[PDB]
Design a protein around this ligand. Structure first.
Ligand code: BGC
Ligand code: BGC
Lengths: 460, 413, 459, 459
């Protein structure tokens, strides 16, 4: 600590930033006014890149309009690359995820870290002497209100992409299972009550179809993010950011990201409570209620062994109950229900954040950021988890399943056309009286013959 | 009274009542709220439309006797015509079993209405039987979800309109105050200036994009069903029936009905609902936001950031004028609160799926409609008695941009 | 439509009010001002009897204080005494449950009502000529800033009193069922995976006891409400209500309601709502959270006849298909499931309100109020419907239940001392590879005579 | 790194655990089995230490009754104390915070770590050198059902304590500003309109009146955590841990922790879901609310200079504005709002989980756990954050705050008992007409004297 540093000045005096540290003062200061969590701007989905990309785009746009020097500019776009590549300058954003000011402190860190990389690429000493001053260069023709969210938009939108991959990955794990159990008679349960014969295979594609729609909805609600904002202005009208610049900027932005992003709804209201995040997250919450229930079924479908819907079998990952062999805890789905619940609850946050909008700026965006990011993150692993650890090892107990179908009283329906509806009923009450089955009542009443009898019952 | 037959014995239902035994029994079993299906945002009208659509189908498919099939759609038209024989839906909004009680009720009300329009005595007289004929090739698992999706689709058309009107109020002021300077504020700190007029246009635009979202999502309801599934696949509707029946449901509701993705999960929880309630929540977030500012902008006289004089609706400190309590933008927060809270209810509900069916459709129902109602009303209550009567305060609005501490931003050169 | 009306006037000019109508000027205006939904101040859980009591109480302390005339004080309360009872003259409180103005709307509604009702009894013609001024004589030494929350608190409390009673009738029902089924054996099961043998009498005792701690949690948080504020806040310590009054009023308010009312510790908050609300509604949400569990169980235990768990039979009361008795819907628990999610959903509606605090007053108290009452009310009924239409007549299925234990793979945990743990560890394993019961594998191998086996197992 | 190992065995198989790893196959297994977040059981509020504190009390009772041999018992509790000697052997708990098994994975994690420190001290090798056994000894007359819950509360009871210290360290800064802002007048707003005069001093004290109540609730609410269930049930009563061990070990826990650990007022369903949780996190939800409210007021009462409120001024933290100065962003009050929002969000997560209870056991405790902790952590650091880089050096622009109180026509009120209501009205009218203050109006409109007028306005 204290050892080998660099003294850097600003509006608020001179402080000695940690030498080698690519983050400058503004950042250094953030690292002290914000101490809530241990989670700092460190990514798995994106954001840091989301920022450096928003810069490159802004950079290569500035050089075009010659708003800034081509000498400094190509250093800035290049600088980006030293962070995009293998992020040969990554995790230089030590600011707590929790931070105030709608994210000035984040655009400020991105600027700084990038400012030095360029400078050092230009062979200069970073820090004290900035021949590539971040402000009038790295962040020229922009402001947090526009540069901050567009970074968050690229990010989330790219995080979502990763989420769908995972979702798809988990779907084949449902499909392979369907193709596996395609012909094992299970009887459904509406309101828990039995219903009408079905195959477990059909139970399992239902899941993959269920997530297929989650994907449909996700990638759809995610396009609200594409309408990025770069080159707007704090309040009304616009500073000189507005010009043929703004569009040229994102035109480069889309040239980097590779996302069909376009100039936002327009240049008014914008940042003021923009809840396209209420929607994109609102999507992540849907996956929650869904995946959860998907995990809710498995846990109960694989309920009590030797005493419960013993239809399937989740992989024993924990320790056997040797002397009390009665167990195989539905562990993997449970943890997923947890993430779901968490996911679900993160909604309630972001909403409050959006509701939090006050006048010409809604600062609570960063809370929407880590909240948003959190869900995409956990869901993904919650998906790979169930996938790799759970669904791939489930296997039905054909016997008790098929036997669920042949012991119901609903199967008398399939006899009705042959023994007359009225006997079917008398066959069904008896079955619901003697404790027997439609296969025995029929056989003790002398209604059919086994050959005949056992020439039907196998679904449709 | 008249005495109808039902498996759980013969219950007797008051003769003038067009519903039937199930409906009757379902009024005793479920007794939570005071509110039965008190549909303001269409619902029942949606339910009847579904039966009327199933009838047209059933006929043009030879499922039931042409006369009965016609007796049906006929009864359906007496209900829709001007929302007539309505009232026969006395089931609590809080009920059970896929809202079976709502499907059955509609079946039976249409029965006695279709009956009389044949000279048959009401109720029990079953030449035109409800289940066999009105509910033919239909089940709770499928009719019910659909009347809900369509009902909701229409309340949302009415919603956006209402919203579009509020929009009007803003883009009215927007052009009104337009000529009025004002000092913008980000983080409540003083940013660069803008015209008080521009402030309101953003409110419109906000709502402009709100609409763009509410419809955008509402169209997902169009993926419906009629004659679908209890389990995986689903019983024998899968003939001309369903698509033909949705084709029917289309031309009737006027809405572009479409047969859903595939027969496997639908009534078994629908993310479409969470999503549409979602759409309704975001609108509640921004509308709430818009009103907050409206209260912040019309704060304490002289000593309290005053830029727009909001309407006055109650008392004035006699001894000395000193208030104009933002009573209306306030009530808009209150609603948005009730709407957002419902997004939890719809969440719990739309997550409690039991294997092959969600039994909580009704609660998502009472939550959806309820939230659509107050919101729809909200937009108006703000419109008529609030924004339509908002007057600026120029000298003050401009005053802030003139005594602007950092005026030099442009005065650099 | 406009069939004969009396003329009244507020600071905002004149208006015409239905003569009959006791809800004067303000309220008439108020009715129009907000067109959110039908439900007006139609509080069955007693919001009016609250406001009326707050006024009856406060008035008495103004007579004892001698602020207003005895004769008009006697009428504020003489009138109050009326409105109360089964809930007499109290009908003229007609403003939409969603209403800005922080409750002035309602505070005035009551102010007026009691004046006119009091004037009718004063022989006076009521109306315009107010001999009990809704403000200068009723609304004396007060303000919404304290009257509204007081009534609210005072109201919610009594409403909660009803809730617990209801909840206990449900507790009594689960009880008698714990007494009935007590001798039925069932295999308890953690994480859905089988755990160990217990009586289906105990599971119901878990229910009553759950609720038992749930009621205690309700009436716990409840009494917090009793800490009120009558005539004071609008900024801090309060306006010129001091001396006897404020503490004396809350005191007399205790002589009315029948509640151990205490003035708040300080008096610099409340205006900006109180966490008591989130707290009490917390108990309501918790209650809802627990009732859900019970019903999800109730449903789970009745799950599918002959193809579900099939332990308890929820009494049938709806449908009926003869040919296929492979059914019987858990409809009543389902409904309670539904009243929960809503009450749970109201925890946000209240929350978001409490948070909406601005400077020295939270202007969203009424959306907390209604949400409050909705929760506290629907829940209560949610109890009786379950009790009366479901649990009060559940039957179990012994042979099935008991057959879940007698056949569970690990019941040899008590034969081990007799067959030697080592031997047991292989029986309970020979069972899994066969499906056979413990007895069978035991009996086949012959490690224990049917007698020295049938003469041991229950507990 | 993966540089060395040792092979342990369980019911499933043999997986070689690290030579430095005091955990066994289980933790290693439970490390792989679940992998959702990048937050394993780091544990900054307490958890681990509370967990070792339970395993320790357990032994202090097993030693006694002798369910295990005095020696090993001492090796166990010796293992405990090494962990607790300042929070030494803490890093040995790598399983995630998101985890199924309902705590089987945390339960064993502890069981092993203490098992290893135990025999190791005894002079035995780390690894399956079981002369102490996690299960057979450390977890004697214990199970996930009672160890994980009871412990979890403990680790949270102690944590919330560190919170009341935060919220109090905060209360101190607040009233610090109260005692300072004494003679600082202003206008208390209700519904954002200028209501009545006061001193900004009380304002900050109001904030504290606010926080102190939170603390009280939290003090009350934490109490619930004390009802522990160590050495209890299995399904619907009690396996064989029940005897004297049951309320003895609780006495031992009470001792080894100091907290008045009392046993369940009964014994069942508590493990199947205790509502004390929904009530505690709810108290934290309330805290985040009223606090966040205050934060929001701070951002308001300081708003934009000469174009916003500007009553009090906040500390400059961010490198200011260069070209066009006119800002002092509430960068911190901002963050406090953000955390508050998460707490509130962590409340629905706790509810949903609290709803996810199934029959004889709730398995969503872990998430209620990771949700409880996240909240107690950021709330504590918020109070200190707020208190340290903001509300410790706030200022007041006395003149404008007095500009406001002396501004609004409201002030007429007190000159009213002197000049007469009638004269008090013209004054109110004139100012309304003109745009002058009650001073100049009562001035030119000859009524009072300079002295008289300045002889009263400070309150
Ligand atoms: O990372 C970009 C993409 O690369 C492709 O090769 C993979 O198939 C995708 O899973 C991945 O999302
Ligand atoms: O009188 C018996 C009780 O039965 C319940 O069903 C009613 O709802 C209560 O109001 C009544 O007190």
């Amino acid at each position: 600590m204290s050892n080998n540093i660099r003294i850097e000045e600003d509006l608020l005096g001179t402080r000695e930033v940690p030498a080698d540290a690519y983050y400058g003062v503004h950042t250094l200061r953030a690292i002290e006014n914000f101490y809530i969590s241990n989670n700092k701007i460190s990514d798995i989905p994106e954001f840091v890149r989301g920022m450096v990309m928003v810069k490159k785009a802004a950079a290569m746009a500035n050089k075009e309009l010659q708003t800034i020097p081509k000498s400094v500019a190509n250093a800035i776009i290049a600088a980006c690359d030293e962070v995009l590549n293998n992020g040969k300058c990554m995790d230089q954003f030590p600011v707590d995820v929790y931070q105030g000011g709608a994210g000035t402190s984040v655009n400020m860190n991105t600027n700084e870290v990038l400012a030095n990389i360029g400078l050092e690429l230009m062979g200069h000493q970073k820090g004290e002497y900035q021949y590539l001053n971040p402000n009038d260069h790295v962040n020229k023709c922009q402001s947090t209100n526009d540069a901050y969210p567009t970074g968050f938009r690229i990010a989330v939108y790219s995080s979502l992409i990763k989420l769908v991959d995972a979702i798809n990955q988990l779907r084949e794990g449902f499909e392979r299972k369907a193709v596996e159990f395609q012909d094992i008679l299970k009887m459904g349960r509406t309101q828990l009550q039995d219903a009408v014969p079905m195959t477990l295979g059909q139970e399992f594609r239902a899941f993959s179809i269920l997530l297929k729609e989650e994907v449909k909805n996700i990638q759809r609600t995610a396009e609200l993010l594409l309408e990025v904002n770069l080159g707007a202005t704090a309040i009304g009208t616009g500073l000189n950011t507005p010009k043929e610049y703004s569009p040229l900027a994102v035109k480069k932005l889309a040239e980097v990201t590779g996302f069909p992003c376009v100039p936002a709804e327009d240049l008014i209201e914008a940042t003021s409570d923009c809840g396209a995040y209420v929607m994109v997250h609102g999507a992540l919450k849907r996956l929650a209620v869904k995946m959860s229930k998907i995990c809710n079924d498995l846990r109960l479908l694989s309920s009590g062994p030797r005493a419960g819907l013993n239809e399937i079998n989740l992989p024993e990952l924990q320790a056997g109950s040797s002397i009390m062999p009665a167990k195989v805890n539905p562990v993997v789905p449970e943890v997923v229900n947890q993430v779901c619940f968490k996911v679900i609850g993160n909604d309630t946050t972001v909403t409050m954040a959006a509701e939090a909008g006050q006048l010409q700026l809604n600062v609570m965006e960063p809370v929407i950021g880590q909240a948003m990011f959190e869900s995409v993150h956990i869901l993904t692993n919650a998906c790979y988890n169930l996938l790799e650890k759970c669904i791939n090892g489930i296997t039905a107990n054909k016997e008790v399943c098929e036997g669920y179908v042949y012991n119901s009283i609903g199967i008398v329906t399939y006899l009705n056309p042959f023994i007359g509806h009225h006997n079917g009923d008398i066959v069904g009450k008896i079955c619901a009286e003697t404790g027997k089955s439609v296969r025995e009542v029929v056989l003790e009443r002398g209604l059919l013959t086994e050959a005949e009898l056992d020439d039907i019952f196998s679904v449709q």
